[PDB]
Design an enzyme around this catalytic site. Structure first.
Site, PDB file in Angstrom:
ATOM      1  N   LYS A  64      26.198  27.295  64.187  1.00  0.00           N
ATOM      2  CA  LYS A  64      25.179  28.321  64.245  1.00  0.00           C
ATOM      3  C   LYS A  64      23.851  27.619  64.151  1.00  0.00           C
ATOM      4  O   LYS A  64      22.920  27.959  64.855  1.00  0.00           O
ATOM      5  CB  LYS A  64      25.385  29.442  63.230  1.00  0.00           C
ATOM      6  N   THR A  93      22.208  52.225  51.071  1.00  0.00           N
ATOM      7  CA  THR A  93      22.314  51.381  49.941  1.00  0.00           C
ATOM      8  C   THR A  93      21.062  51.424  49.094  1.00  0.00           C
ATOM      9  O   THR A  93      21.085  51.154  47.891  1.00  0.00           O
ATOM     10  CB  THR A  93      22.469  49.990  50.515  1.00  0.00           C
ATOM     11  N   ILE A  98      23.836  53.994  45.282  1.00  0.00           N
ATOM     12  CA  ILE A  98      24.619  53.787  46.461  1.00  0.00           C
ATOM     13  C   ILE A  98      24.768  52.351  46.615  1.00  0.00           C
ATOM     14  O   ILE A  98      23.793  51.690  46.871  1.00  0.00           O
ATOM     15  CB  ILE A  98      23.948  54.321  47.713  1.00  0.00           C
ATOM     16  N   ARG A 141       5.916  50.817  43.553  1.00  0.00           N
ATOM     17  CA  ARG A 141       5.536  49.908  42.470  1.00  0.00           C
ATOM     18  C   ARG A 141       4.697  50.602  41.381  1.00  0.00           C
ATOM     19  O   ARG A 141       3.945  51.527  41.719  1.00  0.00           O
ATOM     20  CB  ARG A 141       4.821  48.762  43.098  1.00  0.00           C
ATOM     21  N   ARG A 175       4.235  40.185  30.722  1.00  0.00           N
ATOM     22  CA  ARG A 175       3.651  38.964  31.301  1.00  0.00           C
ATOM     23  C   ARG A 175       2.405  39.167  32.159  1.00  0.00           C
ATOM     24  O   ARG A 175       2.254  38.432  33.134  1.00  0.00           O
ATOM     25  CB  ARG A 175       4.618  38.217  32.217  1.00  0.00           C
ATOM     26  N   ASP A 182       9.702  48.960  37.284  1.00  0.00           N
ATOM     27  CA  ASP A 182      10.224  49.887  36.315  1.00  0.00           C
ATOM     28  C   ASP A 182       9.974  49.401  34.907  1.00  0.00           C
ATOM     29  O   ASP A 182       9.720  48.230  34.639  1.00  0.00           O
ATOM     30  CB  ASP A 182      11.721  50.076  36.498  1.00  0.00           C
ATOM     31  N   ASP A 184      10.956  48.348  31.132  1.00  0.00           N
ATOM     32  CA  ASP A 184      12.043  47.873  30.259  1.00  0.00           C
ATOM     33  C   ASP A 184      11.684  47.895  28.804  1.00  0.00           C
ATOM     34  O   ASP A 184      11.036  47.020  28.325  1.00  0.00           O
ATOM     35  CB  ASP A 184      12.450  46.408  30.437  1.00  0.00           C
ATOM     36  N   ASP A 248      14.358  52.186  31.367  1.00  0.00           N
ATOM     37  CA  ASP A 248      15.570  51.811  30.618  1.00  0.00           C
ATOM     38  C   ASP A 248      15.174  51.344  29.257  1.00  0.00           C
ATOM     39  O   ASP A 248      14.169  50.698  29.098  1.00  0.00           O
ATOM     40  CB  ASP A 248      16.567  50.753  31.138  1.00  0.00           C
TER      41      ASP A 248
HETATM   42 CA   LIG Z   1      12.292  45.537  35.243  1.00  0.00          CA
HETATM   43 NA    NA Z   2      21.401  51.302  45.888  1.00  0.00          NA
END
Ligand SMILES: [Ca+2]
Ligand code: NA
Ligand code: NA
EC number: 2.7.7.7
Length: 327
Positions: A64, A93, A98, A141, A175, A182, A184, A248
């Site tokens: 390839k 996805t 998913i 974002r 940071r 997201d 944390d 989360d």
């Molecule tokens: Ca994160």
């Molecule tokens: Na997904």
DNA sequence: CATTAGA
DNA sequence: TCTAATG
């Protein structure tokens, strides 16, 4: 890094495709060690044969490499890139919840699009229902400007509930990061540590508060130690409502906070780098602890941590602000 | 690599 | 239980 670029790149594209559309774990895996090796290789690859000399570099891949060197493309890359069935999977996805597996199953049945997903909301499980619902907001974002407002709040309830809770917002934001993906929140408490057989309510109380006040809007997954939801800043004095944000929070044995915090603060490199160092310095760092190293090959015995610092000192380093945990 | 859903 | 999906 740039010399080997296109190569590795096409290699990764390839691998990914195997594991996604195809359930070819091996070939998938093939493409990867190879991409991984040619990656390290210190010189312009000039042909398959050259490359071919490499470990994991067979004839298949090598071949390839050639075509790709010869013509700035690759048929199979063209064919897949075009491929409907495959295009579809790549896409579904994206919905939170998913995975590939489900992505194929949906496609099969004929769920190619977002709308498909809509009409078929029923075939979807809660995760993916919420996934589908906040599809837009999920892909967006998180402005620090907002990160700061969120953080603000969280810290309040936490404290309001029990003043003993210690909470830290980790990751990129931690940071300096101008935007995050997201939130944390790491979380520990004194009555909870290594032995002291849980206290699920510990997590619970807080999730409950956050919801109470309308910060948490939904629940993706909540368990005795890891809550996973959706949040939203109070859409002020209307005309401007906030996007639903992934959040989360994790319960932590106070005796393992800092390592944990050390860890999730990153960066992925500063980590590894930090990690590689405690090694020489006769140690061992991991998401939860730091053990002194024994000559016999290996060794245990979990050294006491009270701040990000301790860890640092241990490995006898320079305390590095989160800001500079860059690498 | 360990946590949760779900079937 | 196993198996998917997140991180
Ligand atoms: Ca994160
Ligand atoms: Na997904
Ligand atoms: Na070889």
């Amino acid at each position: 890094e740039t010399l080997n670029g296109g190569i590795t790149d096409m290699l990764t594209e390839l691998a990914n495709f195997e594991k996604n559309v195809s359930q070819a774990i091996h070939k998938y895996n093939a493409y990867r060690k190879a991409a991984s090796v040619i990656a390290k290789y210190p010189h312009k690859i000039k042909s398959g044969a050259e490359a071919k000399k490499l470990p994991g570099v067979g004839t298949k891949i090598a071949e390839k490499i050639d075509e790709f060197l010869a013509t700035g493309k690759l048929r199979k890359l063209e064919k897949i890139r075009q491929d409907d069935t495959s295009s579809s999977i790549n896409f579904l996805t994206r919905v939170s919840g998913i995975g590939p597996s489900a992505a194929r199953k949906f496609v099969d049945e004929g769920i190619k699009t977002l709308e498909d997903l809509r009409k078929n909301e029923d075939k979807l499980n809660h995760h993916q229902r919420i996934g589908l619902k906040y599809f837009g907001d999920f892909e967006k974002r998180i402005p620090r400007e907002e990160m700061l407002q969120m953080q603000d709040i969280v810290l309040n309830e936490v404290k309001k509930v029990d003043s003993e809770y210690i909470a830290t917002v980790c990751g990129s934001f931690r940071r300096g990061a101008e935007s995050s993906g997201d939130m944390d929140v790491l979380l520990t408490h004194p009555s909870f540590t290594s032995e002291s057989t849980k206290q699920p309510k510990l997590l619970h109380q807080v999730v409950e508060q956050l919801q109470k006040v309308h910060f948490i809007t939904d629940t993706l997954s909540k368990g005795e130690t890891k809550f996973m939801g959706v949040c939203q800043l109070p859409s002020k004095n209307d005309e401007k409502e906030y996007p639903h944000r992934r959040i989360d929070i994790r319960l932590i044995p106070k005796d393992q906070y800092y390592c944990g915090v050390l860890y999730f603060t990153g960066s992925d490199i500063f980590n590894k780098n930090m990690r590689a160092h405690a090694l020489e310095k006769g140690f061992t760092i991991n998401e939860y602890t730091i053990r002194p190293l024994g000559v016999t090959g290996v060794a245990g015995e979990p050294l006491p941590v009270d701040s990000e610092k301790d860890i640092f000192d241990y490995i006898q380093w320079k305390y590095r602000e989160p800001k500079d945990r860059s690498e």
